[PDB]
Amino acid sequence: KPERKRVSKLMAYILRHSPEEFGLRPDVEGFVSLNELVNALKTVYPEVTEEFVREIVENDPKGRYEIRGDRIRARYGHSFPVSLDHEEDTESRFLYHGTPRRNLPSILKEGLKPMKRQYVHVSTDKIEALETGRRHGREVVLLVIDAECLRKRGFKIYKAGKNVRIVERVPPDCITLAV
Ligand SMILES: O=c1ccn([C@@H]2O[C@H](COP(=O)(O)O)[C@@H](OP(=O)(O)O)[C@H]2OP(=O)(O)O)c(=O)[nH]1
Known part of the structure; x- marks a missing residue:
């Protein structure tokens, strides 16, 4: 035992x-x-x-x-984003990700690719997206993600609790910049 x-x-x-x-x-x-x-x-x-x-x-x-x-x-207690029941977000039009200014050139060329995990995570709330990025560096840049772009290329968007969403990756076509 x-x-x-x-x-x-x-x-x-x-x-x-x-x-x-x-x-x-x-x-x-x-x-x-x-x-x-x-x-x-x-x-x-x-x-x-x-x-x-x-x-x-x-x-x-x-x-x-x-x-x-x-x-x-x-089955519970995760401290990284999961969609335990594979629940789709069908309603969001725009999603957000905050990138430190440092990673801007690669993110712009590559999009958001999965590294540590099989998927990337973004948010429905732009302020929460900026806060997440600040934990990773100064001078955070807001990425605006067109969710219908994502769905047109077959990337299902999953609810991961509150405002967090996950998706396999975000191609650069679906991204534009903002402050
Ligand atoms: O036989 C066991 C005993 C504990 N555990 C989990 O190891 C952590 C131990 O913390 P503790 O012993 O102070 O409660 C905690 O996980 P946590 O760090 O994610 O909270 C607990 O999980 P749980 O009892 O809450 O399900 C387990 O898996 N199997």
Whole structure:
């Protein structure tokens, strides 16, 4: 039971908080592959197996985790943006992202590409978009994102709680500048 508890706590950290310090990239719903999670756990606890994780999941008294096929997620408590139920934002016309002036040349040429995760996050609220960017640098530049542009190229936009939205990427065509 001690081994189950220390492994469980580490799964909670990986699955809710920082999958990128283990090289993992969750999908929009928060899932990573089970084999990747096992390999990640094994770097701290070499005895972990996929069968051990399945038992932790199925015996968890709180419903912390969900396995769907060969993928696994935490069901709650995330501190990075997820769309747990794949809920589409069909109504937003404009979305916003704040970029420090430093990353302006690459962002303008590339758009917003997924780096740490499988998707990028933006906001419906321009002030909240600016605040997010300030945490990443000074002299933040507002990107205005045409959501209908995004949908025309097949990028579904997902609700991720309150004003946050996620999308696989934002091509440069969908972006214009503002203060
Ligand atoms: O068997 C276990 C015991 C705890 N945990 C989670 O490890 C953190 C431990 O914090 P604690 O022990 O002070 O409560 C916390 O996760 P957090 O840092 O995301 O809040 C908790 O999650 P929970 O009990 O709230 O579900 C787990 O996964 N499995």
